[PDB]
Write a protein that binds this ligand. Structure first.
Ligand SMILES: O=S(=O)(O)O[C@H]1[C@H](O)[C@@H](O)[C@@H](O)O[C@@H]1CO[C@H]1O[C@H](CO)[C@@H](O)[C@H](O)[C@H]1O
Ligand code: CA
Ligand code: CA
Lengths: 133, 132
């Protein structure tokens, strides 16, 4: 009897992803993921991005674990690592804008946006998968 | 509030996918998916193939809804339609072989094999998603 992931999480390339059904601000999103020992989703491959972008686009605007709250225009994942320049292409045209008013990143349609952290949105969690011999 | 798929099913391009935790033979997998008004997975896009293929690689070999049980070298999806020619590339090299000993298609490695239908494998089900 093999489960790679918790119930109602989706397996993808060695990790498990949870899609919220409700909506929260960016900080509470972090918390909610922390409560299940997970991280507001960090993106580390193109395939992951594509996979999340498409779900996310069918649900509505959705938070990822990317912010410039420490230092403006320096976008940091919730684990402290910097936005690799090879994901720069996933920002929508027109984005990011309102630097120092819009500090949290969301999926929106086909790409990424920056948004007011206080706004309520869907969120996604990531944590590692477990094997099956 | 918005939920595209039943609890424990995965949304992808407007369908929902269930991944079995147990193993069943091909005919029993077809049935297992009908229990919930679904079908043993049919592949109708490249992104789908890619998504299912990686999950299968973590679980074990896994049945899809393709066989040639009806007519001995024609590959038909469980819903009656024929294997489109833009999906012939997904066959592993050396596959399909043993035509007529092996009538059912499974996910194995980075492609599709034909296998003996009697064998117990994992399965996946598919039904349409529900919009928001
Ligand atoms: O040698 S096997 O891989 O076990 O058998 C395959 C083989 O790869 C292919 O050349 C042809 O002979 O089809 C057989 C069918 O065997 C099926 O069952 C085995 C036993 O567990 C599975 O591992 C295979 O994935 C499957 O094809
Ligand atoms: Ca913005
Ligand atoms: Ca074979």
């Amino acid at each position: 009897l093999c489960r790679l992931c918790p119930w109602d999480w989706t397996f993808l390339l060695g990790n498990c992803y949870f899609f919220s059904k409700s909506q929260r601000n960016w900080n509470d999103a972090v918390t909610a993921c922390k409560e299940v020992k997970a991280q507001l989703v960090i993106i580390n491959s193109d395939e992951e991005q594509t996979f999340l972008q498409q779900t996310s686009k069918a649900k509505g605007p959705t938070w990822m674990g990317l912010s410039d709250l420490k230092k403006e225009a320096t976008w940091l994942w919730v684990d402290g690592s910097t936005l690799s320049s090879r994901f720069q292409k996933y920002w929508n045209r027109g984005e990011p804008n309102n630097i120092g008013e819009e500090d949290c990143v969301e999926f929106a349609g086909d790409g990424w946006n920056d948004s007011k952290c206080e706004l309520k949105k869907f969120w996604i969690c990531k944590k590692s998968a477990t094997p099956c011999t």
